[model samples]
Target: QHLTVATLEERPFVIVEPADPISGTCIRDSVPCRSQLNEKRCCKGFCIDILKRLAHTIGFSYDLYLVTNGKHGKKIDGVWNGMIGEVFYQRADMAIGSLTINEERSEIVDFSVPFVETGISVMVARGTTVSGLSDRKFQRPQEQYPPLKFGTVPNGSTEKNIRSNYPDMHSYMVRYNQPRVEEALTQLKAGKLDAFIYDAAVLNYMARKDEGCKLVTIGSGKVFATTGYGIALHKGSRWKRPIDLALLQFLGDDEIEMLERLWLSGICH
Candidate 1:
């Protein structure tokens, strides 16, 4: 089968570029579910790797593209955009990335059993946890707290966590022309935000890589939820069945570990 797939350019998950001076997919509404469909080069990352393996094994071909709106389709204003809209409106057949599986998301799209296991947790620090360091360690959070601002990762969990766990907590979203982690940390360091909460894996990777945010992965060892990253499909799409089957066949515990090691060694480790 031939298909159009929507993707974003999150490093180690879905890295997309048109090459230097080539004005890559970043010039589009942007990556991490916003990479251009026409990107030509090594779309390096396990997400891309898994996609290729499934396609070749399951007998299908796909065209990769990005979303123009930059949102991951959270149903704002009763409308879906980003890769979710691409599939919901049938603009594309599928989306593959670090997309999460949630009740709201599942209502509009069919998700394969989680291919990547992850947790929604914290990335904090008054000091350097240096990649959610084992030093500071995770602890149970305060039962009740006053409102404090923090950087946000809109693609998924963090917002949900804050609302459910700390009903009074506040966070901020950013896009002032810097790398996401960089932009977030810049604000975090400036005291513009309190902490950066999102996938534990991603936050940790950023923390260590730059030593910039000086954030740690403390509070609630597995903070919010232990969810798996799954491939997202339009609700009731016939593609769901085969895609799920392909994922089951392609991912075994050992292979899963290997994928994590290859691309996400920092986060997964």
Candidate 2:
């Protein structure tokens, strides 16, 4: 049986690129998810390469497509959205984007063993002086200095955590929340926002690729989320073991590292 895989665009993970305009179909061997009905090319990156390896090792043929809502699956009013929702509702067989594994998502769907360890981070302009998310300056009642304006993408894991744990910071930051990471980063670079919070590894890659090294991560380059990315699946699906085993083998053989170096390779000056 052919599996329908759900994905989303993420830097160095799942990137959108030009594909064959004539044939919308391609194999897991060398091609990524080009829309069968449209002209969009949801093509290659670290996660797509890993998915190709998984398909080869597992003897499965699949069709990949981007999520409908362009989100990373957050529950709202007891309903899931994004790739997790597609899997839960049976529209997709599995998801293999850079989906993060967390407690809330796990309650509705299953995730393979983490392929990449990650965490949340705070990023700022190159010369902006500030500590991490937990710094004293972020807290209220600061007479020594002006408030640090920061924000995260709304309705994401980053916002979920801050909204749940830090009421004061949440209240202050939500008003400045941008709908996407690129928007937040744009504002940060424009000096409209002082800092932008997001997945640590993604931010690291962005900073490295930022033009002329204008962005830098604070908090000593440490992360706060302490999470990892996993392949998401429907709950109670029998395929979990196979996926987990394949990922575990990759981890054991250090193939993930090889792919990381391949897709994430570029010079930052």
Candidate 3:
């Protein structure tokens, strides 16, 4: 049996560079959900690469399909929406994008055990005095200082967590819909937004690229909910258990470190 996998291109995670197929480390220049039909490189992110190696270990043959990001689809919505839409519509057998598991999405598809853990953090432009949520200078009453406007992808987990944690801040949610977090960071650099909220590791990566940006963890500890990244399979896919086992065997420390170095540090910026 053949497996058709749907995946998305998230830079520093799953990147698709049209000009250089083998340039980027993760999900480089590959089409998701259609790789089988086109004979192109399927998704190539760390998770995707690891999964591919694991699939070989289990003696499974698969095709990779490069699914469009939700923002480009217009009506399709975010990554989760795009993945769920594909699975529900029977467009692919499974998805290997960095999909976070949440109750809202569980209703539509089945998720494997936690593959990765991540949390939220704040991305502030260079020269911004706000160091972090613990910074007493920035924590002062908003009336004394100008309102601090925080930027984040609309309807994303980052935005939700910010709102839930800092209900008083004058937060602005941008609905770019595109998976261009760096674009948002560019705006932050231009002083369009005071700060941007996203995953901790992603923000850290961005900070390294631009000395003007600084990533600050929110609150005293983890403020928002913690979740795991999972491989999304169609509801009741027979391959889920075996796939999980394969992942357990393949996703070791060395593989994860290699992925982090290649995708997170190596190709960032």
lDDT of 2 by residue, 48-165 (tens): 8898888899989998887766478888898888888888888888987768888888988889999887777788998988767767666562334656778888766777777776
lDDT string for model 1 (102-220, tens) is 77778888887888876665565656333331222122223326334444665455566555565434322232212376577777777666566677666656655555435555544
Error of 2 at 30 (Å): 6.2
The list of candidate 2 runs beyond 4 A from truth reads 21-40, 141-146, 219-223
Who is ahead in lDDT, 1 or 2? Answer: 2
Candidate 1's C-alpha runs over 4 A off are: 20-42, 126-149, 171-179, 189-194, 211-214, 267-269
- Model 1 earns a TM-score of 0.75
Q: What is the lDDT of residue 226 in candidate 2?
A: 84
What is the overall TM-score of model 2 with all chains considered together? 0.89
Off by over 4 Å in 3: 19-43, 69-80, 131-145, 160-179, 211-220, 266-269
Q: Cα-based RMSD of the predictions, in order?
A: 6.1, 2.8, 5.2
Clashes of each: 12, 1, 14
Best-matching candidate per TM-score: 2
Best by lDDT: 2
lDDT of each: 0.63, 0.78, 0.60
Error of 2 at 190 (Å): 1.3
Q: By TM-score, rank the candidates, best first.
A: 2, 1, 3
* Residue 110 Cα positional deviation in candidate 2, in Å, after optimal superposition: 0.8
